[PDB]
């Protein structure tokens, strides 16, 4: 099956391409509507693969140097294997002298395409966590934050090194466990410092970063003693918050202390940065934080400049190899629009909520320290991604959490997409759900290999390798095989990604529509000028609808959302795997009534029934809808009665179903319990249903059959 194929390959090599069969010629390469791209997850989990405490084995041709994969042609007689990338023939290394046919190295079994080697040679560096706390916030909010950070500390590894930096009007770098006193360095939040400065100004482990097993009690007590910024906040003013510098000081500290190693700068904010560098807004309550509306009409003198600040910052953190997390929780906007590039370029997280004193935040935060079957974090640090390809394939660029190491070669194409112009990428932080989109180009069987070297939470340095092969188009049946290997879902998201990437770095819909058009004219069936005639392979059917939703989503239709909400959304899209991504684009929806068990239904007004309970699953929102009638039988109280033990199983079915997913997922999606009328119903009504899909298709058809 072609579906069975897509599935079994994502499951094993965590990767999905828009086309699983590529153009064998140039006259078809150039004419490719949706580019050859893959949605790649370097750390996808699976049925326990044996880690390989080898020495990966590398081809011996200076330029190539690819890893031994199952596509490599062997000769158990000549103790020689021929690299499938440059054809160079290699001599097995001493340790492989013992290999025989009836017992060969795992890296050759097709089951072990996509494997992970462990490199044990140098003592392992400890994990570095640096808390960066804002003190300008309500007491109840700050206490939560404290109780939260205090718990995070009980989960960290004995060897990990911890650090603390709080702030408000000033920036305090605390020197841990100084004994009977407790000191910290204070700095004006009014001016930035390089790092040399911060180095000279301040003077394995440091005074600031100390083994947890050693400093833990002292840091606990200190976090439990923290208190609101001591500076008063005069009427009609906002606290004077120096976020820009607090970060700029956390950044430099590690940069001059532990450059190029696993580190996590975790910043917690409870309001915007009011004192530049990185100033997002002024201290005048009377005036509001920039909005999208304000932005378009050039009424935002802080954005551009404040944005520049954090951006240069992220680059400094990513260059050094350090991960930045931004944990924002304030009723009003917080300044994510300007800070986005920090959690984005690096593998940093981005959590947003109303206040740190909610279940939503508390839980999401402790999900950051989820562990695996061995008691270790599901994170990695300083991952370097290298993609090797057949002399026939070149790399346009990647779209996802990462930065270019700007390394050249013959793999690099002249058409660069996203962070392009490279065959290598650094990914400071990553998880079993981190997903890049890698755009390829062509200039049987063509292959691409993925080498991901990272630092495990255990400290072990590891190289994840995944080599894939895809059929070369059969010339006497090109466009017919190609079309049948299509992955609408994957393409959709790979196509989406591209668009969003352009928006966030500014019409786009216009580009999105043109191709949907083309994609219809090259693989669609029809009689020119006869709309009615148009149809699509079961292979393309959905692509259109998918396109419908992506063009109407809050991913490209900013307004009606706060710049911040906008940024938060995009952030999580550009990192998620395919599945989760589809949910975002087009939220799934379920119905619950006495007339049968749960069943998914279409996202359309026509699906909202009175005697039915819906459960719309946005990636960011689990919502339960109660139609008029059920709302009534509910408001009535019939539930309580022992006569209607059936009305309960129903009232709670969606609630029961909700809990489950409402935990697995990372950013714990917000929960909603509304009904016909409720003011929260608005979320179901704005996702559901130019105008409606019906007309969208029409207008599309009317153009699919016309001119080319």
């Amino acid at each position: 099956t072609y579906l069975e194929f897509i599935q079994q390959n994502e499951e094993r090599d965590g990767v999905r391409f828009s086309w699983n069969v590529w153009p064998s010629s140039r006259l078809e390469a150039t004419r490719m509507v949706v580019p050859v791209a893959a949605l790649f997850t370097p750390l996808k989990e699976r049925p326990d693969l044996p880690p390989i405490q080898y020495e990966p084995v590398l081809c011996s041709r200076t330029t190539c140097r690819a890893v031994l994969n199952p596509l490599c042609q062997v000769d158990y007689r000549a103790k020689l294997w021929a690299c499938n990338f440059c054809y160079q023939r290699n001599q097995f290394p001493p340790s492989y002298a013992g290999i025989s046919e009836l017992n060969q190295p795992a890296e050759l079994l097709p089951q072990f395409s996509s494997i992970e080697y462990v490199v044990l040679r140098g003592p392992q560096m400890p994990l570095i966590f640096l808390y960066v706390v804002d003190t300008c916030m309500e007491d109840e909010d700050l206490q939560a934050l404290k109780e939260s950070m205090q718990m995070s500390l009980s989960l960290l590894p004995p060897t990990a090194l911890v650090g603390l930096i709080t702030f408000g009007r000033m920036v305090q770098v605390h020197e841990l466990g100084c004994e009977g006193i407790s000191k910290s360095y204070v700095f004006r939040g009014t001016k930035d410092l390089s790092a040399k400065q911060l180095q000279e100004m301040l003077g394995p482990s440091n005074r600031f970063l100390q083994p947890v097993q050693k400093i833990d009690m002292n840091l606990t007590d200190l976090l439990g003693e923290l208190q609101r910024d001591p500076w008063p906040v005069p009427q009609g003013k906002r606290p004077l918050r120096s976020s820009g510098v607090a970060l700029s000081i956390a950044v430099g500290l590690l940069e001059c202390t532990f450059p190029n190693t696993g580190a996590r700068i975790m910043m917690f904010i409870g309001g915007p940065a009011t004192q530049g560098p990185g100033m997002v807004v002024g201290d005048e309550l009377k005036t509001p934080i920039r909005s999208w509306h304000d932005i378009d009409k050039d009424n935002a003198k802080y954005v551009k400049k404040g944005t520049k600040h954090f951006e240069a910052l992220a680059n400094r953190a990513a260059t050094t190899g350090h991960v930045i997390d931004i944990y924002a929780c304030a009723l009003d906007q917080t300044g994510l629009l300007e800070m986005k590039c920090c959690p984005n370029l690096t593998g940093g997280y981005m959590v947003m909520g109303d206040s740190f004193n909610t279940s939503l935040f508390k839980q999401t935060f402790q999900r950051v320290f989820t562990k695996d079957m061995h008691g270790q974090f599901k994170m990695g640090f300083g991952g370097t991604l290298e993609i090797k390809t057949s002399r026939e394939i070149k790399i346009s660029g990647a779209i996802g959490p990462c930065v270019s190491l700007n390394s050249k070669g013959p793999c690099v194409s002249e058409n660069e997409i996203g962070t392009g112009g490279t065959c290598q990428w650094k990914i400071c932080g990553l998880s079993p759900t981190t997903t890049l989109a890698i755009y390829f180009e062509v200039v049987g069987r063509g292959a691409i290999q993925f080498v991901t070297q990272y630092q495990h939470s255990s400290g072990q340095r590891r190289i994840r390798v995944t080599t894939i092969a895809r059929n070369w188009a059969d010339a006497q049946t090109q466009i017919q095989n190609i079309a049948a290997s299509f992955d609408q879902e994957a393409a959709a998201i790979l196509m989406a990604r591209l668009a969003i990437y352009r928006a966030e770095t500014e019409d786009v819909l216009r580009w999105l529509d043109r191709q949907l058009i083309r994609l219809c004219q090259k693989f669609g069936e029809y009689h020119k000028d006869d709309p009615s005639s148009f149809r699509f392979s079961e292979t393309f059917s959905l692509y259109p609808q998918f396109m419908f939703h992506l063009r109407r989503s809050s991913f490209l239709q900013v307004f009606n959302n706060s710049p911040d909400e906008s940024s938060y959304y995009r952030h999580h899209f550009m990192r998620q795997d395919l599945t989760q991504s589809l949910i975002m684009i087009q939220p799934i929806l379920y119905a619950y009534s006495f007339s049968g068990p749960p069943e998914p239904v279409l996202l359309d007004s026509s699906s909202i029934l009175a005697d039915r309970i819906l459960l719309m699953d946005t990636f960011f929102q689990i919502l339960i809808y109660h139609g008029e009638t059920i709302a009534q039988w509910r408001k009535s109280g019939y539930q309580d009665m022992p006569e209607y033990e059936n009305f309960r199983h129903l009232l709670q079915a969606p609630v029961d179903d909700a809990q489950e997913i409402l935990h697995s997922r990372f950013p714990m999606p917000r929960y909603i319990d509304t009904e016909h009328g409720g003011s929260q119903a608005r979320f179901l009504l704005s996702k559901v249903n130019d105008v409606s899909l019906q007309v969208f298709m029409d207008h599309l058809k009317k153009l699919a059959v016309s001119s080319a």
């Binding site: 910290s184 204070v186 700095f187 004006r188 500076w231």
Partner: protein
Amino acid sequence: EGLRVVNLLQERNMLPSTPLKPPVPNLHEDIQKLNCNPELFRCTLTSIPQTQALLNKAKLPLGLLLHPFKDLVQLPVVTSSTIVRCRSCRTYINPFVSFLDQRRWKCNLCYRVNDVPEEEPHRRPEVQNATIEFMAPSEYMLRPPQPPVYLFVFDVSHNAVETGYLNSVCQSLLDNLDLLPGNTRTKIGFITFDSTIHFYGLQESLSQPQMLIVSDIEDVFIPMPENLLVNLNESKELVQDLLKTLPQMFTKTLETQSALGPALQAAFKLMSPTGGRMSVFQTQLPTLGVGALKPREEPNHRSSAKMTPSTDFYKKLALDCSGQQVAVDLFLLSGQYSDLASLGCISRYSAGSVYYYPSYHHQHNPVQVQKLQKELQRYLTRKIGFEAVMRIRCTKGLSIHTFHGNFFVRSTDLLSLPNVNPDAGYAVQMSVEESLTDTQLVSFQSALLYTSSKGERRIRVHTLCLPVVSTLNDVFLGADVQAISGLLANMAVDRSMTASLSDARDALVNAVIDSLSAYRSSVPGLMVPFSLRLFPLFVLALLKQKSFQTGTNARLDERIFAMCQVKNQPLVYLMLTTHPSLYRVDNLSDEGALNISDRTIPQPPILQLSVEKLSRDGAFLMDAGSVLMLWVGKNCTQNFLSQVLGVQNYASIPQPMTDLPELDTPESARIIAFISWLREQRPFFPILYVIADESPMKANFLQNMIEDRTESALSYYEFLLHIQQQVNK
């Protein structure tokens, strides 16, 4: 008494066995009786020259020496709903006013006639007390009485940690926390520093003090609005802990550099709002940030007379504190040069005071240690005035044209005194702008306007009346050698900074010559008026003291501190210092002051400063005002070692001996009886040490025999001999 001439060449034993008593202005029995106390206000010429010409012809300097905030036994306090003062020159109605129309009074200072307000008027305390203290009215303050704020600033560098002063300083504060002057409004603070400024907050909400550190040395600031300067009363327990901790926070320190400037600049900003007293402790040369000084090479007995500040920074910073009623007291415990010639400026212009402790070390100098223990005891428990100022007035015709002391002279004679201590001395120099042909009496009045530790605004006035004369011999008959001496000293100090130590020295020799030389052209040997018989003797000792001496191996920082003392010390202690009192003590008896009820108190006689007076057969105490040094002879009497010293033989007299033992022997009782009476004559407990053995290598005792000759100085006779040669050239 006596109007006798004296030949200094034949006497050579002029110095009396009893303390010298300050001259008595030649004034009507009833005026002199209400005259101010000389220990507080005094003049060099009790007999004022009617004209400048006459003033010059004498060749003696005309000036005043005052010690206004000095501790008194009985102080009259007028709470008058209104303060009676002349409507022209604003002089405080004083004992020397002239009452006529019994409802009008003639201002003794600018002669105008004032109307006595309806509020025997001449029986009013204001006119029966020369030294009085008025309650200031709401007009006499530019702001609510500021509270007491004490900010200590310790230097915690390596060297500074090695000396180990920090320990005692903290124990003192602790033992005397309750004894600090102030009501409940008292505020206290702390800051340490090396390469960085260390602030400390203190909230009762936190488990332990918080050391807040400023590292931007080129741009200091305060890290927290509240808690840095805490309320002693409320926060007692809190501070008490901090003191018990600090000494321990820096034992393994590796900080060599010390950025005193920035530290002080932060020290200042913290206080700026309230003003108060900034107690600064330093132990080495400033080498980081602003205020940095370059090292210097210490002179030896060889280099000639070839002082001033290296930079103005510390002076500039001082005026700033001054304008904020902030005062800085410098405690230097340096073991090497530190450029006090420039550091001092911090205290000189902010009306603070510098305390020096050469090579201070908790183990290596058991002496300085106690000295400090005891000088801190003083500094900590003595009264204090805040945001005060002083003005000195004098009868028309007379003009003060130069001041001497740690203060800042705003518009002529508005001496700003950020802080005022009862140990601060002052001097002034006047001239005759207009002939005193008019009157036959001139008076001087100094008012001390200030804020008590109890938040009360108060004025302290002293008034002095003297007689005008018109003939040399007169000017001479009422001359006060002591005061002439101390006044010249201050002029010399200034003389040196303004020019050189040479000129300073010379001008001191010329005061004696030009003087006696003038006396002669107005009357064989060296003939001088009974009053100036001790004039050359004091100037010599003046030239041999550590402020002007030359042929010695005297280190820079010492010389400077010496001139700092001349400048900020009350005549009485400048004398003790300059001319120690030498008493032989191994044979005290019953001609004592056995008046004081049960205690007798021997009154041995004062010896002149020479080795010709000592005796290997005995022991001699030397009173130098700040310290008491008991030199002992090699061939002393057994009785003295056993019954007074508590030893069996000269050889086993412990090297550094910090104090005698209190043995049950009449010989002990006598010596302890004498010593006790001496220190009771002062607030600054003077340490005593017998270490003065004839081989303890601490025989700097001999440095005080100002009357003998040295490879680098003349003897008394040698001096007299020189003077006479110039007197009649």
